[PDB]
Structure 1
Amino acid sequence: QLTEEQIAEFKEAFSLFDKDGDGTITTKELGTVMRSLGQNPTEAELQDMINEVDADGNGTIDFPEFLTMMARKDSEEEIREAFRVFDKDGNGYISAAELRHVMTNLGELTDEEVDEMIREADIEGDGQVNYEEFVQMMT
């Protein structure tokens, strides 16, 4: 279940996005929050975000939809198969160099963040990033 205190906690979070206290979260309102925390998202990104959480398709997120998403948990398999995209020839391992380059230059991550990543996975140098280990750690 969710707890009485938990539901309160989520209501707080929801209000931090819902600037106009009108019971829903717009793209503009989410963009505002994100820009407030120093990000420069495209309205494309904001729409994609809202669509992942918008159930009834009204274009805004209501509180039900919000606590549905906060309560969302197969994802192990998805993340494992993501690492496979970079697995030279189905090793099971990824070179830490390859991991770092992907993690920094492709996609979304900082050198510090990736240092944490590699430090949480490598078994000395040898056993270069066994991604099965990553996937299990995250789940």
Structure 2
Amino acid sequence: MDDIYKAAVEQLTEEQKNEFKAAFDIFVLGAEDGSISTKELGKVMRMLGQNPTPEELQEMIDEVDEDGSGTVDFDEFLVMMVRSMGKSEEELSDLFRMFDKNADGYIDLEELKIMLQATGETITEDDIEELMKDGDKNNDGRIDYDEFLEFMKGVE
């Protein structure tokens, strides 16, 4: 569910990234490290018609703290913004059978490559590589039903 937000971050118009940087620079008005700590996220949340706790405040900082410095910087702030802007499990099961062509109950690399070529789009050696090691989260050359669910989180 993570690398679905970085895509939305990547496809932000530079006119959207401008408004966010502008709104981010008001956010951090008067912070030492120039970043959203708990004071900054505190004010703008309680003044946004809310009132979260100091503990509950950090779990929004740490939900997008890919730095660990308790402060949401601008790049983490874009991920925080796109997080608040999929496919049902019962429906993903019906499609899991379409991949598993030999009907064994797993999705090996060959079944993935056949679907990729059937997309009509030009597949590369590196598209196939990154996708398989993204879905196969224990490196057994195959994607069982439980991983395929994690693989298709939020995919339209």
The bucket for the TM-score relative to the shorter chain is 0.3 to 0.5
Answer with 1 or 2: which has the greater Rg: 2
Higher RCO, 1 vs 2 (CA within 8 Å, ≥6 residues apart): 2
Q: Where is the helix percentage greater, Structure 1 or Structure 2? A: 1
**TM-score normalised over the length of structure 2:** 0.43
